[PDB]
Amino acid sequence: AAPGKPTIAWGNTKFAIVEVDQAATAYNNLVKVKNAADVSVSWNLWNGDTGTTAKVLLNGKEAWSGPSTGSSGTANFKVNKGGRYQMQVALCNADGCTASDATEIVVADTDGSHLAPLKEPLLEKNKPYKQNSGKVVGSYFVEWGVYGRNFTVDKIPAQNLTHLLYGFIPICGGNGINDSLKEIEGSFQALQRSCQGREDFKVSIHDPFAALQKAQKGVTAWDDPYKGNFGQLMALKQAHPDLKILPSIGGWTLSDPFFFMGDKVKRDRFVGSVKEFLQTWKFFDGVDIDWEFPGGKGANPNLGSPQDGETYVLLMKELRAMLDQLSVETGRKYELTSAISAGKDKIDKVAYNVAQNSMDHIFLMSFDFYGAFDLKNLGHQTALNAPAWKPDTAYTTVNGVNALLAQGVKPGKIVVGTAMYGRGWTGVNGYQNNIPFTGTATGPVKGTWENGIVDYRQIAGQFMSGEWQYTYDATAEAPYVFKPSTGDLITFDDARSVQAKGKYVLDKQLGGLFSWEIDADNGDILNSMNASLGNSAGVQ
Ligand SMILES: CC(=O)N[C@@H]1[C@@H](O)[C@H](O[C@@H]2O[C@H](CO)[C@@H](O[C@@H]3O[C@H](CO)[C@@H](O[C@@H]4O[C@H](CO)[C@@H](O[C@@H]5O[C@H](CO)[C@@H](O[C@@H]6O[C@H](CO)[C@@H](O[C@@H]7O[C@H](CO)[C@@H](O)[C@H](O)[C@H]7NC(C)=O)[C@H](O)[C@H]6NC(C)=O)[C@H](O)[C@H]5NC(C)=O)[C@H](O)[C@H]4NC(C)=O)[C@H](O)[C@H]3NC(C)=O)[C@H](O)[C@H]2NC(C)=O)[C@@H](CO)O[C@H]1O
């Protein structure tokens, strides 16, 4: 007779292809990429003949087989593809094979293949749009927003984006390499811990706890291998297979390393580390470079060189070459983007007409034109146009686009920036004709998280009532609120100014819109980005 039916032994059923060491703070130790997951299964036979061959089946296919030599056994084998498998043990002899009931096993991988889709309800004022315009609709999500701001990946209105950018992935380096981090409490230290035993100029993760280990919706079980932002973004990729999720390298405080990359030894180490990072974290779809900025005038007053232009173009060509190689190794399309200053003085430090040939999209940072960093020369921080009172205003969106176009950049490469925050001042005074932007200020407005900056959610929720004036400047295409008694003045984008930008994009055949930062919106901004670019209301 055929063998008795085996009983699969109770035991761990969760395994990983990319292992995460749960007691490691250094990135080098934290993640271990294997070719295949080591799986184990054991069984007992409570009734009958044990057969002469035991096999482990996944979905009916043999993953292991050996002699059946007693009433219990164990099998250790490798599984090289992520997913959920119905595993059975079968005992066979010449008279037949008898299979156990199936037990699911979970084989983890960083494409999110082991994960349920994370497909969460729209919150706040967000309404559903179809991505059918062909235009970019992007936004940044910040790794540290999961603490105070309490804004997690399950809160992103992901159906309403084409591009989700993760700020920010750091470049390893201590003294003289990331000095701009020292201005943020404990930040520089944290990077040194992550980067322990790791070369400088290779990428790492800045907060491995937030990125990989914090409990979050859908990844809360102790043995879920990937938690935090990365585990949720993997599950988001399962829900939104066409969303481009890009790691963004740099930003205001993590850009110092780029200034060293005129040394091709360092640039090549960087590029190679980016390749390794995308082979490790397969849910990411390319890389965004946010170097602030070639030529200097970024956070560090001691960096910047006339060579930075050339280094930027070389870097993009070499990133593109590495992504094209990754793309054909994998069958995937990988994207290369960059967030750039919109100031013409910074634009013309780079030959974007040359670098565009390597880049899918240019994220024009058409915001921060004005703010509490300059208490004397006030103006709209994210306007499309100059205002009536100063038609020669240098920093406007249109001027940054036109600088790019005047170099020879193709319009379709250019994605226009919209602000999900305001900047502002207090104590504004000495202004004429009821236009507060003609005065000067005494300090920063009281921000939501930091001085001088206010989430749009808070502008809409608190500063559109009581004593606050609200004015839409139709020349500049820009809203502002002003509290006369405290001279508090805030310049921000609203649904109407966003709709202007979006019509301007369609009229000038630009690439789309993107925003900073997704946590600060209540829905009104991203709704308008979508509507204004022609995306159909509704759900695919
Ligand atoms: C025309 C012209 O040329 N004009 C120029 C202006 O351009 C120029 O001003 C600059 O303009 C550029 C653009 O041209 C801006 O850059 C781009 O866009 C954004 C701006 O529009 C930039 O955004 C900024 O991004 C930086 C990131 O580098 C943000 O810094 C982050 O700040 C927060 C505080 O708010 C820090 O938050 C803390 O994070 C830690 C994590 O380690 C958390 O710690 C956790 O705490 C919990 C307890 O609650 C604890 O339990 C956990 O254990 C603990 N975690 C750990 C790991 O231990 C804290 O909780 C957390 N606190 C908060 C509040 O959340 C965060 O760490 C810090 N990040 C880093 C990595 O440093 C900054 O806030 C962003 N600003 C805005 C606008 O929001 C972006 O960099 C860049 N990219 C893109 C695509 O946008 C520049 O911002 C701008 N600079 C200035 C100075 O404004 C001016 C020059 O002044 O000049 C004109 O001429």
- The one catalytic residue in 292, 318, 477, 517 is 292
Three-state SS string over 356-378 comes to HHHCCEEEEECCCCCCCCCCCCC
Amino acid symbol at 293: F
Query: 408-413: long-range contacts (C-beta < 8 A, 24 or more apart)?
Result: 408/353, 409/352, 409/353, 409/356, 409/362, 410/356, 411/508, 411/509, 411/510, 411/511, 412/509, 412/510, 412/511, 413/356, 413/359, 413/360, 413/361, 413/362, 413/511
Q: Is 283 within 8 Å of 111 (Cβ atoms)?
A: yes
Long-range residue pairs from 211-220, CB within 8 A, at least 24 positions apart, any chain? 211/143, 212/20, 212/30, 213/20, 213/22, 214/146, 216/146, 216/152, 216/153, 216/154, 217/118, 217/120, 217/152, 217/154, 218/115, 218/116, 218/118, 218/154, 219/115
Nearest Cα neighbor of 97 from 176, 6, 199 is 6
Question: Which amino acid makes up residue 320?
Answer: R
CA-to-CA dists, residue 536 to 160, 236, 529, 539, 540, angstroms: 11, 22, 12, 9, 9
Q: How far, in Å, CA of 527 to CA of 532, rounded?
A: 8
CATH classification of 108-419+496-538 is 3.20.20.80, yes or no? yes
Q: What is the resolution of this structure in A?
A: 1.8
Name the percent of the chain in helix, strand, coil, to the closest 5: 30, 25, 45
Write the CB contacts of 117 (distance below 8 Å, at least 6 apart in sequence): 235, 238, 239
* Alpha-carbon gap, residue 6 to 91, rounded angstroms: 7
**Closest protein CA for atom 44 of ligand 1:** 144
Cα(169)–Cα(147) distance, integer angstroms = 17
Strands 488-491 and 478-483: antiparallel
* Cα distance between residue 482 and residue 486, in whole Å: 9
Discontinuities in the chain (C→N > 2.5 Å), after residue: none
State the Cα–Cα distance between residues 152 and 141, nearest whole angstrom.
Answer: 9
Pick from 449, 462, 458, 363: which is nearest to 404 by CA? 363
Residue 373 alpha carbon, nearest atom of ligand 1: 96
CA distance 222 to 299: 39
Residue 354 contacts residue 407 (beta carbons within 8 Å)? no
Write phi, then psi, for 217 (nearest 5 degrees): -50, 130
**Comparing C-alpha atoms, which of 176, 205, 157 is closest to residue 27?**
205
Asked how this structure was determined, the answer is X-ray
Ligand 1 pocket: which of 25, 147, 291 to mutate (most atoms <8 Å of CB)? Answer: 147
* Same-fold call for 108-419+496-538 versus 420-495: no
Is the Cβ–Cβ distance between 335 and 363 less than 8 Å? no
Using DSSP, how many helices (H) and how many strands (E) does the chain show?
12, 25
CA of 142 to the centre of ligand 1 (A): 9
State the Cα angle at 321 between 315 and 326, rounded to 5°. 125
User: Where does 1-107 sit in CATH, by number?
Assistant: 2.60.40.10
Per the CB < 8 A criterion, the answer to whether 364 and 459 are in contact is no
End-to-end CA distance of the chain: 55
The residue written with tokens 């003085």 in the block is: 345
- The amino acid at residue 283 is F
As beta bridge partners, residue 38 has: 78
Continuous segment of H or E residues that includes residue 27 = helix 27-30
Among candidate residues 513, 511, 479, 517, the one with its CA nearest the CA of residue 495 = 479
Residue nearest ligand 1's atom 64 by CA: 449
Q: How far is the CA of 1 from the centre of ligand 1 (A)?
A: 71
Task: Outline where 183-298 has alpha helix (H).
Answer: 187-194, 208, 228-239, 264-280
**Domain range 420-495, its CATH number among 3.40.50.620, 3.90.226.10, 3.10.50.10, 3.40.640.10:** 3.10.50.10
Q: Do 363 and 514 touch, CB atoms closer than 8 A? A: yes
* Sign of the alpha-carbon dihedral angle for 473, 450, 463, 339: positive
If one counts every other C-beta atom within 10 angstroms of the C-beta of residue 183, the result is: 12
Atom number of ligand 1 nearest to Cα 252: 81
Helix (H, G, I), strand (E, B) or coil at 344: helix
Which ligand 1 atom is at minimum distance from the Cα of 149?
A: 65
Alpha-carbon gap, residue 93 to 49, rounded angstroms: 9
276 tagged catalytic: no
- What's the gap in Å between 252 CA and the centre of ligand 1? 6
* Neighbour-count burial of 148, counting CB atoms closer than 10 A to its CB (0-12 exposed, 13-18 middle, 19+ buried): exposed
Q: Could you tell me which residues are beta bridge partners of residue 85?
A: 105
Domain ranges of the chain: 1-107, 108-419+496-538, 420-495
On whether the CB atoms of residues 233 and 244 are closer than 8 A, the answer is: no
Cβ atoms of 123 and 157 within 8 Å: the answer is yes
Residues with CB under 6 A from ligand 1: 140, 144, 147-149, 168, 184, 187, 190, 207, 209-210, 251-254, 290, 292, 339, 341, 343, 346, 365, 367-369, 373, 395, 421, 449-450, 453, 516-517
Length of the chain: 540
Q: Which amino acid is at 143?
A: E
- Alpha carbon distance 357, 363 (integer Å): 15
